[PDB]
Design a protein around this ligand. Structure first.
Ligand SMILES: CCCCCCCC/C=C/CCCCCCCC(=O)O[C@@H](COC(=O)CCCCCCCCCCCCCCC)COP(=O)([O-])OCC[N+](C)(C)C
Ligand SMILES: CCCCCCCC/C=C/CCCCCCCC(=O)O[C@@H](COC(=O)CCCCCCCCCCCCCCC)COP(=O)([O-])OCC[N+](C)(C)C
Ligand SMILES: CCCCCCCC/C=C/CCCCCCCC(=O)O[C@@H](COC(=O)CCCCCCCCCCCCCCC)COP(=O)([O-])OCC[N+](C)(C)C
Ligand SMILES: CCCCCCCC/C=C/CCCCCCCC(=O)O[C@@H](COC(=O)CCCCCCCCCCCCCCC)COP(=O)([O-])OCC[N+](C)(C)C
Ligand SMILES: CCCCCCCC/C=C\CCCCCCCC(=O)O[C@@H](COC(=O)CCCCCCCCCCCCCCC)COP(=O)([O-])OCC[N+](C)(C)C
Ligand SMILES: CCCCCCCC/C=C\CCCCCCCC(=O)O[C@@H](COC(=O)CCCCCCCCCCCCCCC)COP(=O)([O-])OCC[N+](C)(C)C
Ligand SMILES: CCCCCCCC/C=C\CCCCCCCC(=O)O[C@@H](COC(=O)CCCCCCCCCCCCCCC)COP(=O)([O-])OCC[N+](C)(C)C
Ligand SMILES: CCCCCCCC/C=C\CCCCCCCC(=O)O[C@@H](COC(=O)CCCCCCCCCCCCCCC)COP(=O)([O-])OCC[N+](C)(C)C
Lengths: 225, 225, 225, 225
């Protein structure tokens, strides 16, 4: 006999949870200002515990609502919720007492999993990755090649941008979004070594040609089916 | 008996209205220069009243031309016209005597509602919003998350850009159009805190990936039907 | 009897003309350097006249080759050729003796009309304009509105960018290609008047939303037929 | 009798080669840092020879594995491999002893030819060029025209950007990716000669209109078939 999971299904529960999420966003936004936060700090304390208490129980409900002896964690969107809320308790007295603030902020992000028409949208929007999941390998290969060619040439011409392999990856990420690829990056270097342009004029091309076929390949297969 | 709304329909009337609109644009453009305006101020006065008088009557015509006891205001494009022209009279002697100038400028904008092939174009171009009216919610959620994560980290590292929640929204709007996201925004901060790049390199990605599916989603459904 | 326009049709003639065009490009490029030009000026003179003489006759041929008593000028691509080459002679001794240089440069541009697969490409690529020939009117209206709203507000806050109606059109053209719309244009102004952002944050949106439907509208009708 | 090319076909061989490629990438990346390289230089030497020895033999295998008396070099992707690896030996004692380093870096690039689903992807991604292989000619013609018009006007107004035909090509490449086309390039010049804007406002248009039809033309034919 099990009179627990019979009418355990609810409808207006989602409105409760979304109101809680929006109230948490409104709470944590206010925490940003310094003068308001110090003065109202006493009031806020009881609230974080209160909000945390409100969440945990409402995910334990879902835990003991849909066949606990089943794929509750084999599914997605539930492992995620549990990870966030449980980290909520685990980092409550962590030596790093401040990551709790960032995670409290990140809490609201579950508002895409508790409402329909968002869960479905992000589900499709992420399942589309393995479609273009091949050109990414190409834009990694042609990315590392230049990231490691540049750093051995322009290492003593401009240590700021091309200082080292991991610091020269950031620059070749700046130059592929076409952001000051001629005011800060190229021109000062090009003023020193004369044949350097063949490295930027051949990266803003062979690099914008893949970001282009990314678009085309995700626009063809996403239309055909 | 009603011999009013029988031949009240007109054809060349639209040419009168469009000539008036273009003349109003030409009038208000000249108002910009200071030397010309002060000298010709006496001449201009009689004109604003004259143009205002010309409009009001020609919208009252439409008011008493197509079944006044019907959906004259339940429709759109008429509520808009009436709002603009009536604000014309309401702000004529407002304590704010200068908003009348901006609204006089904005008057010409009705040139999209008085001519065909523009009304239809803007009608479709705005009705397409509820199609992508879902990804906007996602680009608001993932927007607020970073807008409130950044402001609590980089609040005492660069008060100019990330000074406060409402002043840090503008910056994260600058960095999503890829405008000086490495010359002004990132590099000075990144020179202070070392692991900050994971916040910009993970916003120019997870933020240009939604502006991308915006494009794709509005290019698929706008082709299929 | 007319034994002129019988075998007047030619095949290898196009190779002669394209070789002449490429040689003219190679000639005029060299003219750019100053040291080379002064020294070789004597040699160059005989060449411009020689090239000009070579052209004129080869367009007079076409004039008297395909039914001169027909639509030789009602067609396009011939009126263009004749205009360029005839300007060649007309500006030979013009009071402006230097526009002849720019027009000599522009001469090579006819290389798109004398070779196939380019004439056809540019023909289609320009005939596509009346398709989107409607959104352009909208991007002119919403362009003038802001171009004349901005100049009356920010006329004594930054005369460089928003100095006058014709000088403020250039700025609102800069801000619609998303080029330093927050480093040079907005931020200095926004530091003076506080509520100014509502003018740039509402132009980089309602202005990139039309440049977007430009793309979509020219990608739908250019696929459907 | 030929008992050589009977069971010469292999399967796990590709895993050997890809492990070698990844190990070469990991080896050459470390070479970038200076302190690590000098100290570990003795260890590295034996490795370059070892890796080089490992490659050469494994391409000679393929040479004598698939009908050497056939189109081994008439094919592609094999001429490329052989060119790279053979340059490996040819530049081993070159007067330029340092290009060997860059070529050692470039060695890893063959990781797109030794694994499937990459060879096919790059094959299609390059075979698509002759489709748009016509608009490129147009974007070369309209490119040279402005590249040689600008250099004769703005040669004594700003020698930095428009110094000469080959140095003014770089600038008109900067201005077509819309990168500081109003902060560095235009505004300083435009402050000197007044009617110069008609050269940049008519290049950022007639130049972004071809990069646009590039997109459209490669999105239509790449969908239709
Ligand atoms: C199918 C085939 C795929 C091919 C993919 C190829 C991948 C192959 C992967 C190759 C691995 C890369 C080799 C780097 C190893 C360096 C180790 C090191 O010395 O650390 C140095 C510190 O500095 C760092 O550790 C920087 C951390 C690495 C930054 C990024 C490395 C990988 C990124 C690659 C981008 C990948 C994708 C990018 C685009 C998304 C230590 O030196 P030091 O600082 O002087 O401190 C003292 C040194 N000491 C310890 C001796 C005392
Ligand atoms: C489906 C779920 C959707 C989720 C959406 C989440 C939305 C949840 C919404 C949450 C609301 C946000 C909380 C902020 C409230 C602050 C109040 C405040 O203190 O004002 C301060 C002034 O400064 C301001 O008032 C700034 C105005 C707000 C800027 C933008 C806020 C909302 C933007 C969010 C972006 C939304 C989208 C953005 C992208 C389009 C007052 O402090 P002070 O200045 O020091 O002056 C003295 C203080 N004193 C009065 C005590 C004396
Ligand atoms: C369907 C409906 C369509 C609606 C379209 C609306 C179009 C309506 C068109 C309206 C016309 C615009 C009105 C401006 C007239 C100013 C005349 C003037 O005073 O000149 C001044 C000089 O300065 C100039 O002349 C600047 C030249 C004009 C710049 C651009 C104007 C039009 C651009 C609009 C952009 C259009 C599209 C833009 C996007 C492509 C003279 O003053 P001054 O310099 O002090 O010199 C002394 C003065 N003095 C002579 C008295 C001694
Ligand atoms: C279907 C039709 C197609 C039409 C296409 C048209 C193509 C027609 C091609 C025309 C050729 C161009 C003419 C330039 C020749 C200059 C020679 C010269 O004087 O060198 C100078 C050096 O400086 C250089 O040599 C610069 C090198 C050339 C840069 C790019 C030239 C071609 C680029 C074009 C872009 C093409 C595409 C661009 C977009 C991809 C020498 O002078 P100096 O430096 O003072 O040194 C002393 C001089 N001295 C030796 C006398 C002592
Ligand atoms: C999700 C985000 C990454 C995405 C995956 C990337 C793979 C992993 C890549 C890198 C991971 C390894 C880096 C570890 C850094 C340790 C050292 C360090 O502190 O960093 C240093 C450098 O900072 C960087 O190197 C940033 C690395 C950028 C990698 C991706 C670039 C864009 C990828 C585009 C991909 C698009 C194509 C599709 C592929 C995605 C900063 O500190 P520092 O070393 O002390 O430097 C001096 C500090 N000081 C100056 C303040 C004094
Ligand atoms: C239609 C336009 C907005 C669109 C809706 C946005 C929602 C509502 C958002 C904000 C509305 C609430 C802000 C109220 C401002 C009051 C205080 C103030 O003066 O502002 C201050 C800051 O200025 C800002 O914060 C600009 C806000 C940007 C919001 C949108 C950013 C891009 C959205 C992209 C969306 C794309 C994705 C799809 C979603 C659209 C300026 O004055 P101050 O505070 O005194 O600062 C110091 C002044 N001083 C330095 C000069 C001394
Ligand atoms: C083909 C190109 C134009 C295209 C048609 C544009 C329509 C006609 C528009 C303008 C034509 C009328 C301007 C006449 C200028 C006379 C005065 C003058 O010298 O100009 C002045 C300003 O320079 C400008 O105003 C540039 C005008 C830009 C117009 C188009 C902007 C982008 C359109 C985007 C369209 C995209 C959407 C679709 C619509 C296309 C410069 O000289 P000055 O006044 O002495 O200023 C001080 C000089 N000093 C500082 C050096 C000391
Ligand atoms: C694969 C990359 C090229 C692509 C083909 C390009 C064709 C061939 C084009 C040029 C080749 C000929 C140039 C030879 C240079 C010799 C002189 C020289 O040193 O260069 C000089 C200039 O540097 C340049 O001129 C760069 C040339 C850019 C050409 C392409 C621009 C973008 C094309 C976009 C195409 C997109 C549309 C589709 C078409 C592709 C640098 O040295 P310098 O002269 O001493 O100058 C002073 C040096 N100092 C200041 C440090 C003191």
């Amino acid at each position: 006999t099990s009179k627990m999971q019979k009418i355990v299904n609810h409808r207006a529960f989602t409105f409760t949870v979304i109101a809680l999420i929006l109230f948490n966003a409104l709470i944590v936004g206010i925490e940003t200002y310094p003068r308001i936060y110090a003065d109202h700090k006493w009031l806020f304390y009881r609230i974080d515990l209160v909000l945390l208490w409100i969440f945990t129980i409402e995910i334990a409900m879902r835990f003991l609502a849909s066949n606990p002896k089943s794929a509750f964690f084999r599914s997605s969107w539930n492992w995620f919720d549990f990870l966030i809320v449980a980290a909520g308790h685990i980092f409550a007295g962590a030596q790093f007492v401040t990551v709790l603030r960032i995670l409290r902020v990140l809490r609201v992000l579950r508002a895409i999993s508790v409402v329909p028409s968002l869960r479905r949208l992000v589900d499709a929007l992420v399942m589309t990755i393995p479609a273009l999941g091949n050109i990414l390998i190409l834009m990694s290969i042609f990315f590392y090649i230049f990231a490691v060619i540049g750093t051995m040439l322009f290492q003593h011409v401009s240590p700021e941008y091309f200082g080292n392999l991991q610091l020269s990856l950031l620059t070749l990420f700046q130059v592929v979004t076409l952001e000051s690829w001629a005011s800060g990056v190229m021109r000062p270097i090009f003023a020193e070594v004369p044949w350097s342009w063949l490295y930027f004029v051949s990266f803003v091309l062979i690099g914008t040609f893949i970001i282009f076929n990314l678009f085309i390949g995700v626009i063809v297969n996403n239309v055909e089916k």
